Amino acid sequence: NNPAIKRIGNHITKSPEDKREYRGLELANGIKVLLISDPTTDKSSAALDVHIGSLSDPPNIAGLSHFLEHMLFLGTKKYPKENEYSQFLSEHAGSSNAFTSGEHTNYYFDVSHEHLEGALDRFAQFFLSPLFDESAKDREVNAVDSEHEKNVMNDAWRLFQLEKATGNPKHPFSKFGTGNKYTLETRPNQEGIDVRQELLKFHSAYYSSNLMAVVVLGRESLDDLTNLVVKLFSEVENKNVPLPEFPEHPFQEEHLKQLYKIVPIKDIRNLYVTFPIPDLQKYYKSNPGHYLGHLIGHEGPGSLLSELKSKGWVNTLVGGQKEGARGFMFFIINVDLTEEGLLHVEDIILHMFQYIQKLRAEGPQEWVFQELKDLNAVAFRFKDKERPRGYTSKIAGILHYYPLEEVLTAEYLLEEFRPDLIEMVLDKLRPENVRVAIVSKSFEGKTDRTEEWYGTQYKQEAIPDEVIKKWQNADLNGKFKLPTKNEFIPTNFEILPLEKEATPYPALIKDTAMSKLWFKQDDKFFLPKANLNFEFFSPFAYVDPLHSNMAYLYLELLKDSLNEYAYAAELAGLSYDLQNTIYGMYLSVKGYNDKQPILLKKIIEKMATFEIDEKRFEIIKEAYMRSLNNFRAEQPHQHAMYYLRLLMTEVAWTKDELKEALDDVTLPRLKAFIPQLLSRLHIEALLHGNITKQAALGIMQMVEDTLIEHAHTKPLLPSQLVRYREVQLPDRGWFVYQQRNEVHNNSGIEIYYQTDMQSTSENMFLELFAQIISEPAFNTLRTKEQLGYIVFSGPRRANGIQGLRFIIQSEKPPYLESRVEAFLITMEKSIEDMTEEAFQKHIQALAIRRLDKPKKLSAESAKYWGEIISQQYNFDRDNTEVAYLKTLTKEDIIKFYKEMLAVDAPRRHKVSVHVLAREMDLSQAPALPQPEVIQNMTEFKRGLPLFPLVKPH
C-alpha cells in the first residue's frame, strides 16, 4: 500500500452502458480523487473543486475568493510566465475556466488526448506556490470589475443580490460574491489593506488538501493515472481546516411575512415566493425536495400551473428545492404575471396553498415516489456520454457530498421512501413562514429603498394579518387533482439491429416535391432514443414583419395548447422544440423512441387543426410585445452582434419593426394566416437515431399525410426555396455602423474581416489563423491591456460566407478599433518569427478540435444538421478539411494574411459595428483610413453585391 494514499475504493457504482472505467481514492492529505480512464477520448480533462467559497470572503474585502481564482491563472513559482497556463492549453487544443460559488471554487480544464501530463503539472502548481504578481493584481482587478459592470443591469443578478440584502445583515449570506473594483482595490488601499497579502492570508489558510477534490480523465490507465495524481497532488499542504457550516438560518421572524416590491430594468412581471427550509442534502437517499418540487412544479392535467392558465394569471411556474448552503435551504414557487395577474396576487398565493393542503389532505403518495425511482434509474442507465471538461467539474463538485462508490448515482438514484421527511418539509410551507417578492415596473416611483451594489430600487412592506389568516384557512379547491400515471414512461428499450445497408453518414432516402428525408441509424452510441428534426419551409413565415410575428405567435400559442400534454413526455425524457425561423418552422423531437411517434403525431395534428383561444392569444401577444422591447436592456456586445447580422443578411426585420407591426396582429388575421402558411411547405428533415429505414420513411409519411388530410398541404416549387445571401463587401472598404445603447455604460464592437466564400482552402486558412491568434488575442486584449472582460476572436460563418471577427465589450471607446489593428501587427511579426516546430503545434491542435468525435447522439445530429441547414451537406467535412489543413505552410498563411487581412491588404473587407454608451461619441497602432459611415441599412445593402451560395455535393 502507498502511504500517500489513505484508501482506494475500486468499485464505483457505474452505468452498465458506460464503457469508461473509474477508480476513486482518498489521498493521505484528504483530497478526494476519482480517476476516469477512457482509452478512446480525444480530450483528456481534469478538475479540482475547493470547498471554500465566497461566503468565507473577508468582510472588508468583498469577493476575495473570486479574485483569487482569477489570479491563480496568472502564474506559479515554477511556471512564472503570465500566460504559460493559458497558452500551453491553446497549443494543444484545450480550454480552461473556473467559477466561485458560495461553498466551492471549482477549477477545470480539457487538454489534448496525449498531453495530459504536461498540463496537469502546470495545473497542480496553482495550489502549491502561486506568484500573485502585483503587476497582475493591478490589472486583472479591472477584468473582475468588468464582470460586474456587465451584470449590474441584469435583472436576474439584481434579484439574486436583492435576496441577499433582505436577510440578517451580518449573516455571510448577505455577502457580495463577485466584487467590483471598489471592493478589491479602491477600498482596501483607501483603508491601508495589502490585498496581495490578504490573498496569501486566504490562500494559505483555506486552500488546504482536506477541502479539495480532484477528477482526472484521460486515456492513461487507472494505475498510470493513480501514479500521475499522487506525484502532483499528494504534496498539497494539509491544514485540517474545519468544514464551514452555517446551521443558523439567514431569515429569522423579523424577515418572515414580508413582501418586496422591486423595479426591474426590463418590462417583466414576475412573482417570487420563498419558503425557508432546513438543509436537506443529508437525506439525498430519499430526496423529499424533488418529491414536492415534482408535484408543485407539475404542469399537467389538474396541476397547479394548468389552473393558473385558466384564470389568465400565470404563464410559467417553477417550484421545488433550491440549494442554499450547509445548514439551510429554500423552497421557491416563482411565476410569471399577466397584466391582470399582477393585480390579483393574493388569490394566486391562496390557490398555491389550496394546492399545498391537497398534498397534506391525501398524504404522501408512495406510487409517485416509486415512479420517480423508476424514471431516474432509466434516465441514469441510458445517460448520455458527457463531455470531459464539464463531467470532471461536475463530479469534483459532488465528490465532497457523497462517498466515492456513489458519486455517479448521487444526483440520479433514490432509494428510500420517507413520508416523515416529506411531512417535515410540507409542514414548514405555511403562510406564517412565507416571503413574497413582486417584480414589476408598475412600482417605479413608489420605492423607498435602494440596494447598494446594483442600485435596484425596491420597497419593503409587511403582509397584513388579514391576508395571512385568510391564507391559513386554505380550503381544498376542486380543480386541483394529483397527476395521473405518467403514461409516456418508455417501456421498450430494444436496440434495433444495425442494418447491413446502414450508412456512416445520413443518406437521402426520399426526395419528393414535398419532402427530403435525411436518415442514419445510430451505429455509434446504441441508445434507445432518437432525434427527429424537421425544417418546414414557407416563404410566408418571413415575408413582412406582420407575418414573422404571426409565425411566432402561432407556434407560441401551439405550445401553450400542448403544455398539459407535453409535460408528461418531458419527464419521460421525450422533449420537443418548435420555433419560427426566417425560412419557416423548426420542429425537433429528441428522446426515447418508444412512445415518440405518439407525441410527434399530436404535434402535427394540432398543428393542422389548431383553434386559438382568444384569452390566451392576447396574453401571449402582450408578452411577445414586451419581449421585443426588453432587447434594449441587452448587453452592448449583443447589440453589436445583432446589428451586424442585420447588415450582412439579404433581408432582416428589426425588433422595433416587429413591435410596430404587432398592433396589426388581430385574431381574425392570425386565424387566416394559418391556412396560408400551411398551404405550401417543403419538409427537409433529419431522422437520426434508433430507427429503421422503413420506419423513418413511415414517420415522414405520418407528417406528410397528416398535413395533407388536415391542411390540404400543397408541394412547394423548388424555385421558391431561396435562402438568403450575405452582402459582398468591396475591396479595401471599411464601413462603420454605430448606434447607441440606452442602458449600459460600456461600449460594444464587432470587427468583421470578411475573407471569401466557404471553401476547403478558405475555410482552413482562417481556422488555422484563428487558432494562432486565439490565445494572443485573449492575452493582449484582456489580460495585458485590460480593455474588458468580453474579449473574443474567432471565425464567423454565416450564409456560406466567412471571415474573422473581434467581439469586445469594454468601458473604452470603439480606441478598441485602434488596438485590434495594432494587435494584428504584433501577430504578423509573430508568425514570421514563429518556428516551424511551434507552427505545426497549432496545426495538430486545430486537427484535434475538428476531428473530435461527437460523444453523444444529440451532438452528432446537430453536426449533420449544420450541414443540412447550410445546404452544403459536407458530412465528411471533418476528415476532408483536416487533410488539407496539414498541407498548409507558414508562408501560405502569411500570403493569406497579407492579401486578405493586413491593414494594407489588397482584399481587406472590414466592417465595424460600434454600440456606443450613452455619453461617448506601448504597442503603436497603424494608420487607419477614414471609414464610410453606414447611415441606412437599406440604402447600404442597395449599393452592394450579394455573394453566391455554396454549391451542394
Epitope: 396576487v345 391562496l350 397584513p464 388579514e466 384557512n473
Partner: antibody, heavy 119, light 108 residues
C-alpha cells in the same frame, strides 16, 4: 383615533367621471385592506371593489369591473376610486371601510359620500 | 360568484324578545362571514367577525354561529338600541357579497 373620511361625491351626468377619496387617519393603509361599499337609496348593501394598498392592487365586482379604477397612495395614506361610464344605477352612498385582522372584517367604516347621476 | 340569502325580510319583536336572523350561502364558505348592523342614515357597525368571533366593543347579547352553509345571528334579548337594518357579509378572495337585509322592527 381610527377614522375614515370619504370625499369627492356630488353630481355627475351619464358618461361623466368621478374620483372619490377615502382619507385614512390613525393607521397606515398598507396594514390592511380597504374596501368600497355603495348603497342605493332603498336597497341593501353592495360591494363595489377593494384595494390591498401593499400590492395585489385591485379586486372588483362583476357589476363594475371595467368601469371603475381603484388605487391608493401609501405616502398620502389615502385610497381613491375613479368612477368612469357612470350609469343611473350607480347613484348611491359610497362607504369606505377598513378590513379587520380576520377572514371576514370591515370593522371601521366612514361617513360615506353621495354620488348622484342625473341632469 | 357566491350569493347570500336572508332568513326573514323583516320581523316584529318586543323588548326582551329573542331575535334569530339567518343567512345561507351558495357554496361552502368556511367561517368567513360577518354580520353588520346599520341604523338608518349612518354607516354600518361590525357585529360578528369570522362568523363566530364576537367583535370587541359589541354587547355580549350578540352571538354568531355556523352550520355548514347556514349562518345564524342570535340576539339573546332585543332592546331599544338594537332595532335597525341587519346585513350579513361574505369574505373570500371572490367578490364580497351581502344579504338582501333583515329589518328588525320592534313592537311595544
Amino acid at each position: 383615533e381610527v377614522q375614515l373620511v370619504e370625499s369627492g361625491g356630488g353630481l355627475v351626468q351619464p358618461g361623466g367621471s368621478l374620483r372619490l377619496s377615502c382619507a385614512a387617519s390613525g393607521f397606515n393603509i398598507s396594514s390592511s385592506s380597504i374596501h368600497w361599499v355603495r348603497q342605493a337609496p332603498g336597497k341593501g348593501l353592495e360591494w363595489v371593489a377593494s384595494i390591498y394598498s401593499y400590492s395585489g392592487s385591485t379586486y372588483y365586482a362583476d357589476s363594475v369591473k371595467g368601469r371603475f379604477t381603484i388605487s391608493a397612495d401609501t405616502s398620502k395614506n389615502t385610497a381613491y376610486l375613479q368612477m368612469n361610464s357612470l350609469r343611473a344605477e350607480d347613484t348611491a352612498v359610497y362607504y369606505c371601510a377598513r378590513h379587520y385582522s380576520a377572514v371576514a372584517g370591515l370593522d371601521y367604516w366612514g361617513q360615506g359620500t353621495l354620488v348622484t347621476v342625473f341632469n | 360568484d357566491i350569493q347570500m340569502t336572508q332568513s326573514p325580510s323583516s320581523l316584529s319583536a318586543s323588548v326582551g324578545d329573542r331575535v334569530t336572523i339567518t343567512c345561507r350561502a351558495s357554496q361552502s364558505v368556511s367561517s368567513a362571514v360577518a354580520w353588520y348592523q346599520q341604523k338608518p342614515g349612518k354607516a354600518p357597525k361590525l357585529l360578528i367577525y369570522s362568523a363566530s368571533s364576537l367583535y370587541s366593543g359589541v354587547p355580549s347579547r350578540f352571538s354568531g354561529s355556523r352550520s355548514g352553509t347556514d349562518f345564524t345571528l342570535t340576539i339573546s334579548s332585543l332592546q331599544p338600541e338594537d332595532f335597525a337594518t341587519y346585513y350579513c357579509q361574505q369574505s373570500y378572495f371572490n367578490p364580497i357579497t351581502f344579504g338582501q337585509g333583515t329589518k328588525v322592527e320592534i313592537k311595544r
